[PDB]
Design a protein around this motif. Structure first.
Motif, PDB file in Angstrom:
ATOM      1  N   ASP A 126       0.547  -1.319  -0.057  1.00  0.00           N
ATOM      2  CA  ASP A 126      -0.042  -0.058   0.017  1.00  0.00           C
ATOM      3  C   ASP A 126       0.850   1.158   0.219  1.00  0.00           C
ATOM      4  O   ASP A 126       0.582   2.350  -0.783  1.00  0.00           O
ATOM      5  CB  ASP A 126      -0.993  -0.128   1.274  1.00  0.00           C
ATOM      6  N   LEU A 127       2.080   1.033   0.610  1.00  0.00           N
ATOM      7  CA  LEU A 127       2.691   2.295   0.951  1.00  0.00           C
ATOM      8  C   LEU A 127       4.069   2.441   0.007  1.00  0.00           C
ATOM      9  O   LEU A 127       4.493   3.630  -0.197  1.00  0.00           O
ATOM     10  CB  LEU A 127       3.514   2.332   2.419  1.00  0.00           C
ATOM     11  N   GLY A 128       3.843   1.644  -0.768  1.00  0.00           N
ATOM     12  CA  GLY A 128       5.183   1.336  -1.854  1.00  0.00           C
ATOM     13  C   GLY A 128       4.915   1.849  -3.282  1.00  0.00           C
ATOM     14  O   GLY A 128       3.825   2.478  -3.577  1.00  0.00           O
ATOM     15  N   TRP A 129       5.928   1.774  -4.114  1.00  0.00           N
ATOM     16  CA  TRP A 129       5.857   2.190  -5.535  1.00  0.00           C
ATOM     17  C   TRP A 129       4.709   1.463  -6.235  1.00  0.00           C
ATOM     18  O   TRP A 129       4.333   0.311  -6.014  1.00  0.00           O
ATOM     19  CB  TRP A 129       7.457   1.609  -6.183  1.00  0.00           C
ATOM     20  N   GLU A 174      12.158   1.879   4.252  1.00  0.00           N
ATOM     21  CA  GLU A 174      13.755   2.604   3.438  1.00  0.00           C
ATOM     22  C   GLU A 174      15.005   1.864   3.684  1.00  0.00           C
ATOM     23  O   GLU A 174      15.904   2.275   3.055  1.00  0.00           O
ATOM     24  CB  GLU A 174      13.842   4.025   4.013  1.00  0.00           C
ATOM     25  N   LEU A 175      14.938   0.779   4.495  1.00  0.00           N
ATOM     26  CA  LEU A 175      16.001  -0.057   4.805  1.00  0.00           C
ATOM     27  C   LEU A 175      15.952  -1.274   3.811  1.00  0.00           C
ATOM     28  O   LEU A 175      16.909  -2.115   3.731  1.00  0.00           O
ATOM     29  CB  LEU A 175      16.183  -0.690   5.991  1.00  0.00           C
ATOM     30  N   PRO A 177      16.494  -3.235   0.293  1.00  0.00           N
ATOM     31  CA  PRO A 177      17.326  -2.869  -0.580  1.00  0.00           C
ATOM     32  C   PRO A 177      16.312  -2.259  -1.857  1.00  0.00           C
ATOM     33  O   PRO A 177      17.011  -1.378  -2.384  1.00  0.00           O
ATOM     34  CB  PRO A 177      17.931  -4.124  -1.042  1.00  0.00           C
ATOM     35  N   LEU A 178      15.000  -2.639  -1.996  1.00  0.00           N
ATOM     36  CA  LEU A 178      14.383  -1.674  -3.079  1.00  0.00           C
ATOM     37  C   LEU A 178      14.275  -0.289  -3.069  1.00  0.00           C
ATOM     38  O   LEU A 178      14.376   0.424  -3.970  1.00  0.00           O
ATOM     39  CB  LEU A 178      12.858  -2.489  -3.024  1.00  0.00           C
ATOM     40  N   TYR A 179      14.220   0.279  -1.896  1.00  0.00           N
ATOM     41  CA  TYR A 179      14.120   1.523  -1.536  1.00  0.00           C
ATOM     42  C   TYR A 179      15.539   2.421  -0.957  1.00  0.00           C
ATOM     43  O   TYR A 179      15.362   3.384  -1.190  1.00  0.00           O
ATOM     44  CB  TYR A 179      12.816   1.876  -0.385  1.00  0.00           C
ATOM     45  N   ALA A 180      16.342   1.514  -0.448  1.00  0.00           N
ATOM     46  CA  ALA A 180      17.642   1.948  -0.086  1.00  0.00           C
ATOM     47  C   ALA A 180      18.434   2.647  -1.480  1.00  0.00           C
ATOM     48  O   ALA A 180      18.251   2.188  -2.489  1.00  0.00           O
ATOM     49  CB  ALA A 180      18.371   0.922   0.528  1.00  0.00           C
ATOM     50  N   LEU A 181      19.371   3.426  -1.150  1.00  0.00           N
ATOM     51  CA  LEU A 181      20.485   3.901  -2.151  1.00  0.00           C
ATOM     52  C   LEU A 181      21.357   2.826  -2.418  1.00  0.00           C
ATOM     53  O   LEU A 181      21.575   2.172  -1.570  1.00  0.00           O
ATOM     54  CB  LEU A 181      21.130   4.904  -1.725  1.00  0.00           C
ATOM     55  N   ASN A 200      14.263  10.569  -8.010  1.00  0.00           N
ATOM     56  CA  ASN A 200      15.077  10.828  -7.000  1.00  0.00           C
ATOM     57  C   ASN A 200      15.060   9.880  -5.888  1.00  0.00           C
ATOM     58  O   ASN A 200      14.174   9.993  -4.852  1.00  0.00           O
ATOM     59  CB  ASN A 200      15.001  12.523  -6.560  1.00  0.00           C
ATOM     60  N   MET A 201      15.991   8.896  -5.917  1.00  0.00           N
ATOM     61  CA  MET A 201      15.885   7.650  -4.988  1.00  0.00           C
ATOM     62  C   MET A 201      15.929   8.495  -3.532  1.00  0.00           C
ATOM     63  O   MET A 201      15.410   7.669  -2.810  1.00  0.00           O
ATOM     64  CB  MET A 201      16.746   6.753  -5.171  1.00  0.00           C
ATOM     65  N   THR A 202      16.720   9.063  -3.075  1.00  0.00           N
ATOM     66  CA  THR A 202      17.010   9.753  -2.076  1.00  0.00           C
ATOM     67  C   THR A 202      15.581  10.441  -1.185  1.00  0.00           C
ATOM     68  O   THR A 202      14.936  10.063  -0.256  1.00  0.00           O
ATOM     69  CB  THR A 202      17.839  11.100  -1.805  1.00  0.00           C
ATOM     70  N   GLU A 203      14.844  11.074  -2.330  1.00  0.00           N
ATOM     71  CA  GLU A 203      13.521  11.574  -1.634  1.00  0.00           C
ATOM     72  C   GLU A 203      12.618  10.513  -1.510  1.00  0.00           C
ATOM     73  O   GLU A 203      11.512  10.567  -0.734  1.00  0.00           O
ATOM     74  CB  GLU A 203      13.102  12.720  -2.834  1.00  0.00           C
ATOM     75  N   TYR A 204      12.369   9.437  -2.438  1.00  0.00           N
ATOM     76  CA  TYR A 204      11.553   8.386  -2.482  1.00  0.00           C
ATOM     77  C   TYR A 204      11.532   7.716  -1.207  1.00  0.00           C
ATOM     78  O   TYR A 204      10.640   7.265  -0.542  1.00  0.00           O
ATOM     79  CB  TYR A 204      11.200   7.546  -3.690  1.00  0.00           C
ATOM     80  N   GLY A 205      12.919   7.556  -0.805  1.00  0.00           N
ATOM     81  CA  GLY A 205      13.206   6.627   0.213  1.00  0.00           C
ATOM     82  C   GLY A 205      12.952   7.221   1.569  1.00  0.00           C
ATOM     83  O   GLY A 205      12.498   6.827   2.481  1.00  0.00           O
ATOM     84  N   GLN A 206      13.422   8.628   1.680  1.00  0.00           N
ATOM     85  CA  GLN A 206      12.899   9.305   2.840  1.00  0.00           C
ATOM     86  C   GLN A 206      11.188   9.570   2.725  1.00  0.00           C
ATOM     87  O   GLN A 206      10.701   9.457   3.977  1.00  0.00           O
ATOM     88  CB  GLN A 206      13.382  10.999   2.709  1.00  0.00           C
ATOM     89  N   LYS A 207      10.673   9.639   1.646  1.00  0.00           N
ATOM     90  CA  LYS A 207       8.983   9.713   1.757  1.00  0.00           C
ATOM     91  C   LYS A 207       8.534   8.320   2.466  1.00  0.00           C
ATOM     92  O   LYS A 207       7.515   8.609   3.225  1.00  0.00           O
ATOM     93  CB  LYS A 207       8.515   9.808   0.527  1.00  0.00           C
TER      94      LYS A 207
END
Ligand SMILES: *[C@@H]1O[C@H](CO)[C@@H](O[C@@H]2O[C@H](CO)[C@@H](O[C@@H]3O[C@H](CO[C@H]4O[C@H](CO)[C@@H](O)[C@H](O[C@H]5O[C@H](CO)[C@@H](O)[C@H](O)[C@@H]5O)[C@@H]4O)[C@@H](O)[C@H](O[C@H]4O[C@H](CO)[C@@H](O)[C@H](O)[C@@H]4O)[C@@H]3O)[C@H](O)[C@H]2NC(C)=O)[C@H](O)[C@H]1NC(C)=O
Ligand SMILES: *[C@@H]1O[C@H](CO)[C@@H](O[C@@H]2O[C@H](CO)[C@@H](O)[C@H](O)[C@H]2NC(C)=O)[C@H](O)[C@H]1NC(C)=O
Ligand SMILES: *[C@@H]1O[C@H](CO)[C@@H](O)[C@H](O)[C@H]1NC(C)=O
Length: 323
Positions: A126-129, A174-175, A177-181, A200-207
């Motif tokens: 639900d919360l993901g891509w 965010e931890l 690996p799909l969402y981590a840098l 912007n992987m940084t922005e999506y991970g923080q989101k």
């Protein structure tokens, strides 16, 4: 253990064969009064947490979780080509299956308020891509509406006579690996997000950290308000299992939880963005927090299961009990 039957709702973290049933039946759920065939090879690479928990408790597992699931397809949904329909959701598909099944003594010979535990683990999708993370939900819906959906799952269980509820909260996505840098072991373009490196992987991970931690606050305080103040579920017990904190604890001290090589920031089963080809890492899958970039390993799953049984016993650093 003080339960005979464990009933679970959720997604691939929990699924023990039910999406496979849908694929093998043209997108149809099991006929009411039947369950799907159980597999011992789940998205974890082995047993799911629910299988470990039921096996250690000596309980019957009734696992309605479906790989790919969200809480409500009226909130957000994703199409699955192999079944020519949306991935099944808890309110739309899993709960209606459970509501019909409890009428059959052949599936539920002696289901009581005392002897059955009901658990829900939902939100990774639900919360993901392709869902809330890409603003793909029904326009106007928010992550507050996802949290309300989780409580609506417990309302439906309650109306069948269920009284012992466990909500597993959202992991630190965010931890994953799909969402981590990539600098921190994260995927480049993934089978689950095949355009990741264009964003912007940084922005999506923080989101997704903001969304998961916010849902977790709302689930804990909402469960306390509804259970203890509004008496939404009279004579029910509601546990919130803080699996977010357990995952942070594994990540921060892997030599305490995993075999060698004590890997928390990569993943065992490494596939190209097409979903193939795939190579497995060297060493034991018991040395990896993550089976693939989104799914916890069977070792992590066994740790979730042991802590889950402590929560149900009302003696867990990760459990908060409300009535
Ligand atoms: C992709 O997406 C990412 C994530 O959104 C974007 O990166 C973020 O960019 C913003 C700029 O728009 C960054 O903010 C700036 O950060 C610098 C550096 O400090 C930051 O990192 C420090 C190192 O760990 C940390 O200690 C800092 O925290 C302290 O200071 C801030 C002050 O902002 C304060 O809020 C904290 O309480 C701490 O005291 C901080 O996290 C900083 O120097 C910049 O300052 C400018 O802006 C501030 C206003 O906040 C102002 O006071 C200054 O005068 C000056 O104008 C600014 O804060 C941010 O850190 C990035 N975040 C992450 C997680 O990486 C990225 O830009 C996107 N790229 C694209 C192409 O879209
Ligand atoms: C997780 O699943 C893996 C894969 O089945 C299990 O490991 C295999 O275990 C057998 C028997 O011990 C070995 O022969 C294989 O070499 C192992 N393979 C890998 C990939 O490690 C592992 O035991 C399971 N862990 C748990 C906690 O159930
Ligand atoms: C898929 O489902 C759609 C919508 O329900 C239906 O009209 C169509 O016949 C199906 N297509 C295939 C290829 O099965």
């Amino acid at each position: 253990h003080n339960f005979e039957t464990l009933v679970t709702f959720g997604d691939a973290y929990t699924d023990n064969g039910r999406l496979g049933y849908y694929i093998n039946h043209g997108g149809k759920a099991p006929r009411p009064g039947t369950m799907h065939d159980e597999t011992t090879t789940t998205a974890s690479g082995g047993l799911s947490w629910a299988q470990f928990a039921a096996r250690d408790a000596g309980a019957t597992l009734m696992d309605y979780a479906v790989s790919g699931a969200v809480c409500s397809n009226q909130i957000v949904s994703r199409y699955f080509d192999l079944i020519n329909r949306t991935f099944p959701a808890i309110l739309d598909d899993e709960i209606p299956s459970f509501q019909a099944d409890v009428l059959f003594k052949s599936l539920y010979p002696h289901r009581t308020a005392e002897n059955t535990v009901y658990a829900v683990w939902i939100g990774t999708n639900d919360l993901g891509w392709g869902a809330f993370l890409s603003d793909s939900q029904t326009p106007g819906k928010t992550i507050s509406d996802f949290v309300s959906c989780v409580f609506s799952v417990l309302d439906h269980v309650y109306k069948t006579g269920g009284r012992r509820f466990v909500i597993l909260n959202t992991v630190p996505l965010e931890l994953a690996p799909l969402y981590a840098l990539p600098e921190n072991g994260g995927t480049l373009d993934s089978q689950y997000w095949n355009t990741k490196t264009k964003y912007n992987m940084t922005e999506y991970g923080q989101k997704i950290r903001e969304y998961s931690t916010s849902v977790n606050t709302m689930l804990e305080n909402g469960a306390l308000v509804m259970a203890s103040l509004k008496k939404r579920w009279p004579k029910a017990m509601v546990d919130v299992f803080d699996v977010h904190s357990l995952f942070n604890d594994i990540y921060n001290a892997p030599t305490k939880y995993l075999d060698a090589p004590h890997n928390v920031n990569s993943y065992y089963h490494q596939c190209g963005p097409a979903g193939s080809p795939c190579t497995d890492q060297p060493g034991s899958l018991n040395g990896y927090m993550w089976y693939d970039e989104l799914h916890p390993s069977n070792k992590t799953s066994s740790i979730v299961a042991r802590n889950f049984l402590d929560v149900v016993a009302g003696k867990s650093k990760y459990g908060t009990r409300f009535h």
